[PDB]
Design an enzyme around this catalytic site. Structure first.
Site, PDB file in Angstrom:
ATOM      1  N   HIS A 218      -3.175   6.883  12.206  1.00  0.00           N
ATOM      2  CA  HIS A 218      -3.656   7.350  11.319  1.00  0.00           C
ATOM      3  C   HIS A 218      -4.550   8.428  12.389  1.00  0.00           C
ATOM      4  CE1 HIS A 218      -5.817   5.641  15.081  1.00  0.00           C
ATOM      5  NE2 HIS A 218      -6.811   6.256  15.232  1.00  0.00           N
TER       6      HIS A 218
ATOM      7  N   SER B 158      -1.243   8.258   7.211  1.00  0.00           N
ATOM      8  CA  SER B 158      -2.661   8.194   8.010  1.00  0.00           C
ATOM      9  C   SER B 158      -1.650   6.712   8.095  1.00  0.00           C
ATOM     10  CB  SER B 158      -3.759   7.506   7.519  1.00  0.00           C
ATOM     11  OG  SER B 158      -4.490   7.379   7.767  1.00  0.00           O
TER      12      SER B 158
ATOM     13  N   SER C  87      -9.785   5.873   8.905  1.00  0.00           N
ATOM     14  CA  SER C  87      -9.640   7.158   9.653  1.00  0.00           C
ATOM     15  C   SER C  87      -8.618   8.173   9.441  1.00  0.00           C
ATOM     16  CB  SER C  87      -8.820   6.524  11.462  1.00  0.00           C
ATOM     17  OG  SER C  87      -9.168   5.485  11.768  1.00  0.00           O
TER      18      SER C  87
ATOM     19  N   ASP D  74       2.441   2.977  13.145  1.00  0.00           N
ATOM     20  CA  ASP D  74       1.027   1.708  13.192  1.00  0.00           C
ATOM     21  C   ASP D  74       0.817   0.911  12.362  1.00  0.00           C
ATOM     22  OD1 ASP D  74      -1.829   1.412  12.599  1.00  0.00           O
ATOM     23  OD2 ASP D  74      -1.179   2.750  14.918  1.00  0.00           O
TER      24      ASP D  74
ATOM     25  N   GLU E 143       2.739  -0.153  18.663  1.00  0.00           N
ATOM     26  CA  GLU E 143       1.543  -0.130  19.288  1.00  0.00           C
ATOM     27  C   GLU E 143       1.186  -1.619  19.098  1.00  0.00           C
ATOM     28  OE1 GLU E 143      -1.928   0.185  18.688  1.00  0.00           O
ATOM     29  OE2 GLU E 143      -1.887   0.803  17.514  1.00  0.00           O
TER      30      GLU E 143
ATOM     31  N   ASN F 196       2.062  -2.159  23.596  1.00  0.00           N
ATOM     32  CA  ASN F 196       1.129  -2.798  24.004  1.00  0.00           C
ATOM     33  C   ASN F 196       0.830  -3.938  24.532  1.00  0.00           C
ATOM     34  OD1 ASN F 196      -1.831  -4.344  23.055  1.00  0.00           O
ATOM     35  ND2 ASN F 196      -0.905  -4.761  21.294  1.00  0.00           N
TER      36      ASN F 196
ATOM     37  N   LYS G  88      -1.944   0.641  28.505  1.00  0.00           N
ATOM     38  CA  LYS G  88      -2.637   1.170  27.720  1.00  0.00           C
ATOM     39  C   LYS G  88      -3.914  -0.233  27.277  1.00  0.00           C
ATOM     40  CE  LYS G  88      -3.223   0.644  23.146  1.00  0.00           C
ATOM     41  NZ  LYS G  88      -1.910  -0.179  22.514  1.00  0.00           N
TER      42      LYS G  88
ATOM     43  N   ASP H  10      -7.587   0.211  26.655  1.00  0.00           N
ATOM     44  CA  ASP H  10      -8.170  -0.105  25.962  1.00  0.00           C
ATOM     45  C   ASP H  10      -8.457  -1.350  26.005  1.00  0.00           C
ATOM     46  OD1 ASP H  10      -8.607  -0.848  23.242  1.00  0.00           O
ATOM     47  OD2 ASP H  10      -6.372  -0.311  22.736  1.00  0.00           O
ATOM     48  N   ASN H  11      -8.445  -2.146  26.566  1.00  0.00           N
ATOM     49  CA  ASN H  11      -9.552  -4.308  26.328  1.00  0.00           C
ATOM     50  C   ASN H  11     -10.108  -3.857  27.735  1.00  0.00           C
ATOM     51  OD1 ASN H  11      -7.231  -4.063  25.100  1.00  0.00           O
ATOM     52  ND2 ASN H  11      -6.631  -5.533  25.928  1.00  0.00           N
TER      53      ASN H  11
ATOM     54  N   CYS I 146     -15.249  -0.735  26.297  1.00  0.00           N
ATOM     55  CA  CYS I 146     -15.830  -1.406  25.534  1.00  0.00           C
ATOM     56  C   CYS I 146     -17.175  -1.847  26.785  1.00  0.00           C
ATOM     57  CB  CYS I 146     -15.398  -3.329  25.671  1.00  0.00           C
ATOM     58  SG  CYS I 146     -14.122  -2.956  24.133  1.00  0.00           S
TER      59      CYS I 146
ATOM     60  N   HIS J  60     -12.079 -10.012  16.215  1.00  0.00           N
ATOM     61  CA  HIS J  60     -11.232  -9.567  15.429  1.00  0.00           C
ATOM     62  C   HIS J  60     -11.515  -9.685  14.063  1.00  0.00           C
ATOM     63  CE1 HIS J  60      -7.260 -11.669  12.964  1.00  0.00           C
ATOM     64  NE2 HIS J  60      -7.390 -10.432  13.280  1.00  0.00           N
TER      65      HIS J  60
ATOM     66  N   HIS K 156     -13.454   4.798  21.308  1.00  0.00           N
ATOM     67  CA  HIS K 156     -13.463   5.000  23.447  1.00  0.00           C
ATOM     68  C   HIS K 156     -13.941   6.781  23.079  1.00  0.00           C
ATOM     69  CE1 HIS K 156     -12.305   1.133  23.961  1.00  0.00           C
ATOM     70  NE2 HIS K 156     -11.795   0.651  23.227  1.00  0.00           N
TER      71      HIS K 156
ATOM     72  N   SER L 179      -3.746   5.705  26.178  1.00  0.00           N
ATOM     73  CA  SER L 179      -3.079   5.173  25.084  1.00  0.00           C
ATOM     74  C   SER L 179      -2.336   6.009  24.132  1.00  0.00           C
ATOM     75  CB  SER L 179      -3.472   4.474  24.131  1.00  0.00           C
ATOM     76  OG  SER L 179      -3.520   4.296  22.885  1.00  0.00           O
TER      77      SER L 179
ATOM     78  N   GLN M 266       3.636   6.706  23.859  1.00  0.00           N
ATOM     79  CA  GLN M 266       3.992   6.673  23.160  1.00  0.00           C
ATOM     80  C   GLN M 266       4.922   7.763  23.094  1.00  0.00           C
ATOM     81  OE1 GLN M 266       2.074   5.288  18.925  1.00  0.00           O
ATOM     82  NE2 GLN M 266      -0.107   4.671  20.476  1.00  0.00           N
TER      83      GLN M 266
END
Ligand SMILES: NC(=O)c1ccc[n+]([C@@H]2O[C@H](COP(=O)([O-])OP(=O)(O)OC[C@H]3O[C@@H](n4cnc5c(N)ncnc54)[C@H](O)[C@@H]3O)[C@@H](O)[C@H]2O)c1
Ligand SMILES: NC(=O)c1ccc[n+]([C@@H]2O[C@H](COP(=O)([O-])OP(=O)(O)OC[C@H]3O[C@@H](n4cnc5c(N)ncnc54)[C@H](O)[C@@H]3O)[C@@H](O)[C@H]2O)c1
Ligand SMILES: NC(=O)c1ccc[n+]([C@@H]2O[C@H](COP(=O)([O-])OP(=O)(O)OC[C@H]3O[C@@H](n4cnc5c(N)ncnc54)[C@H](O)[C@@H]3O)[C@@H](O)[C@H]2O)c1
Ligand SMILES: NC(=O)c1ccc[n+]([C@@H]2O[C@H](COP(=O)([O-])OP(=O)(O)OC[C@H]3O[C@@H](n4cnc5c(N)ncnc54)[C@H](O)[C@@H]3O)[C@@H](O)[C@H]2O)c1
Lengths: 458, 458, 458, 458
Positions: C50, C73, C78, C128, C153, C178, C183, C187-188, C192, C312, C371, C379, C383
């Site tokens: 995206h 995309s 996005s 993606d 990813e 991933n 990453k 991300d995780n 958050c 999820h 984020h 992240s 790539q």
């Protein structure tokens, strides 16, 4: 009749009337505590502090307790009409639709001090910034003899009210709420700890973890500001002149430094310690002073730093030198870009610039929505409760030999403060213990309070 | 005049005073700032505050500012056997004994007043027990022609001084050093925070993360204890009678609970919420009330719960019932184990028992050193300033006509208090900035003068 | 011809690029360091991620290294038009259309791989969601004889790649990011932590101090979710099904409780722990499983509760039950209130309603901006660095002796992940120590790293 | 037979065993359910785990679960005095030397395997120190054909066990437990967090709030250490050599610096950054490397610095540089003064010295008690299940052809560790939810099996 902004607005923020009162329990609590018992049955209040979505709760509480009011807007923003129109459809008269500018707002005051042209039957007076107090004494001295008491909510008012009683032209005893414990801790220390880091991160949308910041002043607001920044993982430093506040900052776990070499300021370029200022990403001013961010301070700063203030006055940062010799650019509806190269002719790819969140205005108002509903609730209950003590004494009916003895400005008694504290505690779900009669005589206190002396330091 | 408990222990005490000196900035900050001009030359000082590892620095500072002293101790058991000989090693006298008897308690207190056989022309007296400031009037009322003032650090003696001021039998002005901010923040809030969980873990070596504890009271000591518990990963509950303290607890992120159903204390076991007490791991009392932990609280606790007391009062937890009914047993030279099986004949490994740390007395009695040198500096500093202010204002040398205006009790002025913190902040490596002439006139205070009003609570 | 809808928006679109590139030191450092060598000279690349802002920055990054890209995309939602038109004016056509009928999704994917009338040279594939990777293996397999590598990813893509390798239909080696360290951690866990308490306050403006919340799931996302609420002043509780993870929750300072009697669920309402749900205010779900917040959880909740999901999809909370029994009302396009009174209408003054945030879908990027740039920086760097290393080996021209030998699906080499990390630390201003040749062999690793085993848990 | 100094110490040893017995939920809940069934019936186990009062229950439950055990102390100083007698009184032979010499325990090893000179016909070894494993093949190669299971504790033992497997010298299955989840985050992370501040405060008695410390390394021990200092009101910096953990440190709110300019260490005084070493006053080395704190930073450090070590050896800080030019003095059993002046000229009023606690060795075990019982409960319960799992496989009864493939070195299975976590949690009062069969397949697991993939980082 009635005139505020318009008629049809009933669904923009009017639903927050239910939401805010559910988030503000103390006002909703004491209303059930005094039912059948009507302490304010027959009181005539006019009322003007700061009209918001979370202000009409005061009007509702006074209406429920039997008071009679007629509301007029105060200043800065006349119509925060998100739910202003609902007042008039209910029956309460509200006048705020005026010729909207800040040089005539006395015409908004003129309509709350009187009903038809004759000065009203006011016996208590409700105003924040004194924008109403001089009107009675300077212009309309006729009704004034009937007033039992008055109250206000800022230092800008009590300053004159104490002076204006010193000369003796005040004819009414006054009550000050700004010294109430549940107001001082709520409005100053706690209100900022929620609003500040929110307001900073809404405009910049930057990451604050791992960066270094500077806080100017460690008064009542400085503590909340430093807490809000530290809870996000920043590196926080404090600037201060008061040795006690520097002590309390050192104990709390912060580093205290000086923006000038050895703390001596003389206006020369050789006095500003560039090394410390060349590695700071953020500065925020809390002090209620003037010219605390000097121009020579502001030109040795690190690239791409952020400037902010939560103080009171527009000359905390040297914006007079800022609106000249350097160019300005808007990137978002509330933030600006300023270039250090020269007056005009900046390049898009240039590296040298700064950013200003609110120029010289308070950040939590331009970039945020003031204060949360629960924190400011700890003062409007003092508002509705101070009128109780004044209306019960009937000062306007006392003999002259008695009035002269008890004419003075006073602070709210601590029993009302304990009552409001209890009512706002019970909203969180806590349970308060009680003392058996044997324990009370040992400690020397009654059963219904108060529990602490006037000299106590909460 | 070397009548000390033991004469051969000076060096160890001196060496331990060295580290305290390194950890108390103000005592030498003043000693360096006011050196040379000798503001305290010619004063006569007699005092009795407990001779320990930190009061010696105070005594040495007063003798260093130019005065000459003879010393004794209020409490004989509070005498430190090591540092006492350090005074004995010099021309400075001392009467620090450990006679273990209250009969000699009144002899040691009496010995301060007299030179050797006739009472001393004391310019001042500093006290912590309150016995000195009364023996001047009960037994020897003739020296007061040479006195200038008195100093007191303890509570429950300031009450006596106030009652005596209304009694009219005093002849001396009094300084209330207790009400200083540097005095209040250090001893009450900061001191308990550093030493509570330290003492708990020294006593029991129990893992505290994941436990659930209940704290009685949220005063200054309650604030110092709740954070010291929660920072270790403990779930903390708070109980209170005063709504204001409960509110302060709620806004800090805690839970307010009551040991009794709806908070009403009846004494009978049917008015007790045993559901909450069946999953509580620790009970600590921070208040100064009487019979806070009633006999029917600890009968319905969970098995293997910890009980301790951090307030000065010795009867906040009912040990009378525990002496009356249940057995006792020692696990370590300071910790005790209580069995609920009966008065005597406890089983070897029965599961129904409790643990009590220090017989319900102060946890600082024998488990921890109390407070470190850096926290009690807020008390030792103001003692010398009180006499610096007091000595120059010569009450005795003043003519009798003007002396009538100086009989009162004075809270130490804020100007002197600010000098104390500047020494403590400067010892940490911080810097305190100064004011330009424009800024000082802008807010209404001078460049050098006090900054805050007396109604301002820090 | 480039086709980005409102093609005249490029000048407005390019504006935000100049300010965003300063907040990602990693990509700027890649451009500054690898310039001159031109690592990707002649490497044609197909892409699918995206485009919002920063993927355009990545596009500008790899084309600065000598590469050539075509683009489309992946997420359909996005599709920020402003960043795509900027690159389109910068020199390469883009096809940033929305999904519409999902044919233009394929058509933009078609034009990414198809010129005017023929397919043509292509080496790298950067996908993606695995949407193009399917098309190469299917549809047009003759092009795979020249395709050089594939990068993905997502965790749903590595499973498909491994399953494909099991069957043997895979033809070209692939690399996945991933499972990497930076990453996953950025991300995780982080992000958050930064974004959750920002998103809660934007949509509700509620106060967070001294309040109770329940969090289900304590994985990597939930662990960062819990700390966001703790620093704001809540009392939170963690529910968990895995014994190992619940061990860390207690050791972190949170009590672990189950919503069911002894943790046993049997489809009956008498199996829930009703005494707990009638007291909670906030629920955040951090699982990836169906019915972790069942229909009996909501039916026993306390009134005025706020729910959030960062898991999820709309299977964790039973919205299916909620859209056949309960009515819905709009407040603002962030939140909703849902009445438990019934289905056929409602009154606005009721108390039995429930608050919903970003209905049945992710919140931290739904009611917020997701984020910040500094976290997405790491992240996106993995790539672009993957395309570098996956180029030297020259798979396409290898003979059959080695061509079938090196076919594998693998995670990144650990040295690449450390190269990405160095530029992030230098962005904050930190300094990394170097190992002397007498200090690195003691660990057993060369000076340049990597210094940690493959099985290390950071 | 018994080598205890006096056998009369068991009486109170049993009582202390009882009082420490309640602090280990795992070692008691394992027996409490496995009772009735006999999983170790006839299992002759030979063990050398460090015997302490907390391991008294370990030995007691191992012999009460059906096994017969003989013991020794494979470290000279790893012995608690009371436990030896308290467990010998039950009839279990313990040969722990209180003489504390090398060859005496070396003798006790060779009689730990001899019943009366005929070797004990044991079937398993519960090894701790590895010297037994060496002499299995070195001294008496005859028992390689007898035993069929070994479980070991320290990583210095697996460093031999899992690489010496290359030649199959020991054809016996063995299980390593150090990399297990419930031990990887018990001994290192939460133990240091609990113990470091207590260790520093027991020796220094300092006030931690307001000071400036430097912690070198950010591993698991480093991550646990830093919080223990931040929670005490300390401002601290973190340095490292591995970029990824430094990136984590930046996100936790710590500033990354280096003692050398630009991070390059060149072994000369011109590279040490004198800016920060002139203000830091406490050092904690949390990394296992040589010369992490070399001589130059010790010579340039501030006067008031305290040196601490949490590593394993005496190489993280240069202690050899100390002894050859600086003299040492002791004031507290494990606190020393490091006089920087040199050997001679020993003045007591000096300000030029350092405070070194445990001679540079591991400070925690030299100045404090160490790990709490609850933390050590997880670290010891794994050996029991390792031995049981090696019992339920019966390698010695398998056919020789199948014995070739059964030979392997593998870490503890995940299900046993999950059961350990389940037993540990219930000691905290937590309740764990059970999976319903429908949700079990959605994730793709059973309702009691392992829930996480084999490579998931928690
Ligand atoms: N934005 C809001 O929502 C909001 C709400 C309430 C009040 N305010 C305003 O915020 C301001 C903050 O005042 P406060 O309550 O903190 O006052 P305060 O009395 O608590 O102390 C102000 C601090 O500034 C320090 N200071 C003054 N001059 C200084 C100088 N030259 N250098 C360094 N430090 C200096 C003082 O020593 C003191 O520590 C007030 O003016 C108040 O009107 C804003
Ligand atoms: N151990 C120490 O180091 C130490 C230090 C200073 C003072 N103290 C002593 O501790 C006591 C109180 O400490 P403080 O100085 O903070 O005074 P404080 O008055 O502020 O503390 C007492 C608190 O307990 C509350 N309280 C009173 N009765 C209660 C009851 N029945 N149930 C629950 N709460 C109740 C009071 O409202 C108050 O908040 C005093 O006796 C004081 O001398 C101990
Ligand atoms: N919103 C975001 O920014 C974001 C980012 C990454 C991942 N995610 C989402 O988060 C999830 C992945 O989380 P993770 O990376 O932490 O993985 P994870 O596997 O560690 O998270 C699942 C956790 O929930 C627990 N759990 C599962 N079922 C449960 C139940 N019935 N009751 C209680 N606990 C239960 C598991 O034991 C585990 O601890 C996915 O749904 C993914 O889409 C969201
Ligand atoms: N006392 C205890 O409770 C305890 C517990 C476990 C281990 N240990 C022992 O102490 C050590 C600590 O183990 P750990 O879990 O911290 O190991 P770790 O490997 O997880 O952490 C050490 C960290 O230090 C970093 N490092 C290496 N050289 C460095 C240098 N010169 N400067 C700065 N950082 C450097 C490494 O990159 C690594 O991140 C172990 O070697 C072990 O022997 C002690």
């Amino acid at each position: 009749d009635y005139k505020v902004a318009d008629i049809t607005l009933a669904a923009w923020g009017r639903r927050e009337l239910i939401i805010a009162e559910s988030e503000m329990p103390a006002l909703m609590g004491l209303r059930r505590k005094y039912a059948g018992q009507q302490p304010l049955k027959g009181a005539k209040i006019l009322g003007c502090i700061h009209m918001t979505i979370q202000t009409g709760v005061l009007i509702e509480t006074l209406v429920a307790l039997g008071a009679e009011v007629r509301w007029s807007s105060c200043n800065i923003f006349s119509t925060q009409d998100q739910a202003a129109a609902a007042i008039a459809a209910a029956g309460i008269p509200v006048f705020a639709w005026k010729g909207e500018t800040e040089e005539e707002y006395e015409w908004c005051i003129e309509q709350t001090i009187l009903k038809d042209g004759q000065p009203w039957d006011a016996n208590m007076v409700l105003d924040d910034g004194g924008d109403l107090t001089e009107i009675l004494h300077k212009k309309y001295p006729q009704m004034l003899e009937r007033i039992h008491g008055i109250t206000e909510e800022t230092t800008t008012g009590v300053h004159r009210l104490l002076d204006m009683l010193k000369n003796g032209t005040l004819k009414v005893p006054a009550i000050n709420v700004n010294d109430s414990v549940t107001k001082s801790k709520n409005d100053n220390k706690y209100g900022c700890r929620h609003s500040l880091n929110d307001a900073i991160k809404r405009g910049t949308d930057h990451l604050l973890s791992g960066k270094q910041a500077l806080v100017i002043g460690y008064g009542d607001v400085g503590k909340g500001s430093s807490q809000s920044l530290r809870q996000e993982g920043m590196i926080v430093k404090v600037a201060e002149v008061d040795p006690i506040c520097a002590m309390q900052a050192c104990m709390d776990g912060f580093e205290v430094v000086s923006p000038y070499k050895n703390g001596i300021n003389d206006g020369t370029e050789a006095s500003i310690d560039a090394a410390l200022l060349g590695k700071i990403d953020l500065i925020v001013t809390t002090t209620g002073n003037v010219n605390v961010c000097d121009a020579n301070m502001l030109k040795a700063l690190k690239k791409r730093a952020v400037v902010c203030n939560i103080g009171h006055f527009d000359n905390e940062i040297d914006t007079a030198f800022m609106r000249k010799n350097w160019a300005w650019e808007e990137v978002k509806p509330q933030v600006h870009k300023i270039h250090r190269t020269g007056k005009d002719g900046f390049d898009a790819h240039n590296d040298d610039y700064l950013i200003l969140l609110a120029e010289g205005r308070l950040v939590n108002l331009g970039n945020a929505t003031g204060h949360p509903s629960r924190i400011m609730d700890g003062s409007f209950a003092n508002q509705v409760l101070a009128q109780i003590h004044l209306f019960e004494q009937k000062y306007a009916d006392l003999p002259a030999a008695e009035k002269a003895k008890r004419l003075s400005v006073e602070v709210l008694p601590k029993k009302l403060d304990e009552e409001v504290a209890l009512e706002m505690v019970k909203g969180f779900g806590g349970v308060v213990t009680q003392l058996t009669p044997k324990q009370a005589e040992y400690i020397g206190v009654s059963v219904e309070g108060p529990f602490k002396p006037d000299t106590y330091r909460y």
